[PDB]
């Protein structure tokens, strides 16, 4: 039976459940109050067709469907959006090429057009069948065709129900309430403790460089990008930070790095963090790796050992050892590869772990456990990280990481992206290398818009301005993303104290998008792909206005769209609001003050909410943030007329001058 | 521990095993006698390395692989032949373009290189690892290689062992001793019963129709065969024989077959057998409809019932039906479709069904239930049995039915017939369309010289001749295939008795042979593809002559072959003999005596065993049988020479007049 345990959010234990899952996993805690602030609304299912059972060592579960209903979520797929009709089984990969359930998040949570959402809290691999199965018991089974005589006859029938099996004696399910689709997803988001609150650094340009890059290349690329014009916050190592990686010793090469304490204070120095590459794969020349060994699973990853993250025994050398010999050098992040797949690489499920916990829970789980205790070392000293991994899962809502991967078809790229919003992670539709400076600027644009700005260079060493043929939209495009830092900031905050994930597909406020997305709450985003000159767009209904010049481009209806190799298509929703700061080169310090310009789109009155406090530690659990409330509209003579709220006593306050700007003429 | 219950066969029972398996499904009965014949051999891992083990709920098998060791098996794959470092889950499928472990045929049975085998009696899906896992404990694990530095570095390391698991509490696992690959594979299909011994009939061969053609329609097409002087033992009748398909009714269509009992007869009485497609979809308009219902599924297929048949209940209600409106009006067999997938169309793993079995083990054993069920009902009546089933699994060795598909890539078609041979069942690469003449006759060619001869014009409507530029060709081919029967007879015989399968790869008396296989004991089939001029045949040590000329073709080398349209690449080996009746349009009956002349080729001193019976009962049984021993060679003057051992006293005598041709100049 279900127990209403927040508004909008019920709980059935069927059988007995596992003592491990994802939301353990995780260490993943509700936000109480946010949930609390919610809508109660009624239990999603009200006429029956919910069963929930236990047979032959498994847990079966059905949750009815209605005619009208689409699906979405079931993790980060790449090519497909609707979900109605799949059949997956999830479970953490490197993605494969196709939708099969194999992916970096094969996240246990959908949701529903009707409003609601699901999320089975197993960290086994769970099979899915989201309306295929025709029972013969249903209430809308189909009446038997004759193929023979018959032209109707389907391949197909009408099947009325999700289907869910988890190989386990029992499950944690959790049922979320609407009215909308989007409410379901923010309460799933707040129930694994909301998204994190990223350091303001975090949203700015990183430019991870080649793996066999010496301190002085870095120092000299970081030069360049300053000698050039070009923002930089974070700079990425990869693995020759390492004195030996695959496997790794996790501690700094001494002819690349001879002097680690020093090469991290002198970037600090420019206003340059690091982000070091990892895999968690021990090295018999690593440090600890005597006193780990005897908690690590059976099986190797590329002759490293794999640690049981589970058990205290392993976790002490390995995170005492990235505290003490980066972290507490200066290092801000970590790039965490190689916790997804593929199969072959990664240890098999006929593996055993010194913790007792199954190969399979551990392959669903260990994205999520190097997030969690990585992060963890990070909040101890009351300081934001941002990174990346290559895995995680239902639980991992509140991860300070990124996933990426090494596939490239950016059309997946950016379905991929609206995805995320569905599964409770973050993506980034990184930019590597590219064939033409065409795809080059196609890639970063649509890059710019999405959670991490990003060039991994690990292995091409392309920089921002490596195909001359782009180069100058390159850099306004990578200038306008310093310019719209309070814009991505303030949609970061409304995914951790909301639940609202920035990059969401169409429809979240009748056939599938999968080329567009939400990019906070005002901007419609429909990326182009190189090769095509131009693109159909189809807007929602109310009114939307160009980006770049605040001109009608329509309402409810499908564009035509040529917009030029410079410019990206995007469209802000009428009375949409943009904040803009200064094009800065580096992020904002915690004690600076800085500059507005609201850009304000259409006629409709415009209410904004602008997030602020000191971009970087964790004072704002204490309330050391303020929301200021921003609004805009045109008086009589058609004049711009806006308002910011006042600044907070005793709270930061890093808002400068503020001036108002009517984009639609 | 092993018990040793037959020469070269060892039994291990690991945990508790499940009460059903696929020995059981099938209900398997050893050859004890032609067991007890084989050579006793010693256990093959005689150095420790074997790990069996129950953990979490589930059995965990380890098998020690040396460096030199290369692997076959695990079912029927269409694009790999060897199986060292593949990834596998078997599980019955119709397959879907690359080889995971989802096919018709996923026998969970492999076999080394090192002379042994090991076969898995679960009815689970089953993961394999077949040599990727690097343990740490190894013995032979490779040291760890600095990536960053070392160009040596390796992706996929060193792995020494076979590793599988089974999602279940304990399992019965069979090992088979050598001394070489092909012994074990013997010995497993011999612990299955040994191949079934078809009628001769079932050697010959198979128009199948258009789906919806009449009574008239089939005897017209049978007049034309004949008229044209075509062959033609069978013709099957595709989904319009029956009153309603997808599901059906399992009884005659009154209109196509108003009067069935007469259109039968009158086929037999032209030498004609009748061969009915059915999927086992039980039509509410069938007449036992109602007394089966509660022995069906929870979940349909195409709006169909689908049958417990591990239930009497169910079990008796069908097969009476097939029984009484069909077998005892005079059909031959069945062609049994639709038992293996895609997923969508069959049954989820939630499904529930009435006697209790998990509907996973239903997946895996249908296509065997539906088998043996359906060959008892002619083995009762004395009869032989011959027909087409689109999935099977271990323990189908003894079945009378033939595997093929809706897949249609040529030299993957053949890449099956190689990989049938290690997975205990029979595989046919059919014809059913094609977009040349060309291509229509390298498949005929290809397709003669398989269990079984076929076109298969359920929807295209061809015929052996409907490409006229090839049709001349094409009718040699027809009657090459009736000439060689006593060839194919004595082959199939060995499959029964021995356990020999008659089609299978090369090397099993250095790198991948997916297309050539041996089909008998004698001949080297290399099979053309369309759009080919020439092809290399990699011919094995010893010397081998050309099929057609008998002129000397090389020995242990790789030959450059341009056969020719009208040729298909067949060499035979060094007094290899294949036994000719004339070309018949018809298999002769069993009280009927037939002409052979004896090819011999090369100038080894040549014999061949001839298998001679009725060719139609199960009276083999019973002893009603012969080996006719024939020897050939050349003389001093290069005069043939040859012999046949006398005929037994009261034995069945089909052989009349024998003569003998010395094919090699
Ligand atoms: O060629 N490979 O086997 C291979 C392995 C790993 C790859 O990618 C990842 O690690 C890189 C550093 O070695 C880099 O950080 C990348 O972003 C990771 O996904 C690529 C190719
Ligand atoms: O278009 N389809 O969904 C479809 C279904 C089944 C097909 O193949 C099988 O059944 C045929 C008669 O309907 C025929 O016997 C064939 O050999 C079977 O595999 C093909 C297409």
Chains 1, 2 share one sequence.
């Not at 690990?458 to 921002?464: D, F, I, Q, V």
């Not at 814009?487 to 920035?502: I, L, Q």
């Not at 600044?647 to 003429?665: C, Q």
């Amino acid at each position: 039976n279900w127990t209403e345990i927040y508004p909008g959010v019920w709980k059935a234990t069927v059988g007995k459940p596992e003592s491990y899952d994802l939301l353990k996993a995780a260490g993943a805690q509700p936000n109480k109050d946010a949930l609390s602030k919610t809508e109660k609304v009624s239990f999603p299912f009200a006429n029956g067709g919910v069963s929930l059972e236990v047979s032959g060592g498994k847990t079966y579960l059905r949750f009815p469907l209605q005619k009208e209903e689409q699906l979405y979520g079931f993790g980060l797929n790449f090519q497909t959006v609707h979900q109605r009709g799949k059949i997956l089984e999830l479970h953490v990969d490197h993605y494969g090429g196709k939708d099969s359930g194999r992916t970096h998040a094969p996240t246990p949570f959908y949701v529903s057009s009707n409003g609601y959402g699901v999320f089975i809290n197993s960290a086994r691999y769970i099979k899915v069948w989201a309306g295929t199965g025709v029972r013969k018991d249903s209430e809308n089974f189909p009446t038997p065709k004759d193929r023979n005589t018959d032209k109707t006859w389907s391949s197909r029938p009408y099947s009325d129900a999700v289907e869910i099996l988890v190989p386990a004696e029992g499950v944690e399910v959790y049922v979320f309430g609407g009215p909308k689709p989007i409410d379901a997803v923010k309460r799933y988001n707040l129930l694994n403790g909301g998204g994190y609150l990223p350091p303001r650094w975090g949203l700015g340009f990183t430019q991870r460089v080649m793996t066999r890059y010496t301190d002085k290349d870095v120092e000299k690329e970081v030069n360049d990008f300053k000698e050039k014009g070009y923002p930089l916050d974070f700079v990425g190592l990869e693995p020759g930070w390492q004195s030996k990686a695959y496997p790794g010793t996790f501690s700094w090469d001494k002819s690349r790095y001879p002097d680690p304490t020093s090469f991290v204070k002198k970037m600090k120095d420019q206003g340059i963090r690091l982000n070091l590459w990892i895999n968690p794969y021990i090295s018999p020349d690593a440090p600890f790796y005597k006193e780990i060994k005897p908690y690590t699973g059976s099986h190797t990853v590329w002759l490293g050992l794999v640690p049981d993250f589970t058990m205290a025994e392993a976790r002490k050398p390995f995170f005492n050892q990235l505290l003490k010999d980066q972290i507490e050098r200066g290092v801000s992040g970590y790039k965490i590869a190689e916790v997804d797949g593929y199969d072959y690489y990664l240890w098999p499920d006929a593996a055993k772990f010194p913790s007792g916990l199954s190969a399979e829970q551990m392959r669903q789980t260990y994205g999520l456990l190097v997030q969690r205790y990585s992060a963890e070392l990070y909040k101890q000293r009351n300081e934001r990280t941002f990174g990346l991994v290559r895995a995680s899962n239902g639980g991992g809502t509140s991860f300070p990481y990124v996933i990426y991967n090494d596939y490239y078809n950016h059309q997946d790229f950016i379905t991929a992206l609206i995805n995320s919003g569905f599964a409770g992670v973050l993506w980034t539709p990184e930019v590597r290398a590219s064939k033409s400076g065409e795809e080059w600027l196609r890639r970063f644009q649509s890059n710019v818009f999405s959670p991490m700005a990003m060039i991994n260079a690990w292995a091409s060493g392309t920089k921002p301005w490596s195909y001359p043929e782009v180069e100058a939209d390159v850099k306004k495009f990578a200038l306008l993303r310093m310019q719209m830092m309070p814009y991505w900031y303030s949609a970061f905050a409304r995914y951790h104290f909301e639940g609202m994930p920035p990059f969401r597909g169409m429809g979240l406020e009748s056939k599938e998008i999968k080329d567009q997305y939400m990019a906070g709450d005002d901007l419609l985003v429909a990326p182009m792909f190189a090769g095509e000159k131009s693109r159909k767009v189809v807007l929602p209904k109310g009114k939307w206005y160009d980006f770049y010049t605040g001109e009608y481009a329509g309402d409810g209806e499908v564009l035509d769209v040529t917009p030029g190799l410079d410019k990206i298509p995007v469209y802000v929703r009428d009375g949409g609001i943009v904040p803009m700061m200064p094009a800065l080169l580096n992020s904002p310090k915690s004690n600076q003050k800085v500059d507005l310009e609201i850009r304000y789109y259409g006629n409709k009155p415009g209410e904004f909410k602008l997030y602020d406090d000191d971009g970087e530690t964790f004072n704002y659990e204490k309330g050391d943030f303020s929301w200021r409330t921003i609004r805009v509209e045109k008086d009589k003579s058609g004049k711009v007329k806006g308002s910011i709220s006042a600044a907070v006593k005793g709270k930061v306050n890093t808002v400068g001058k503020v001036t108002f700007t009517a984009m639609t003429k």
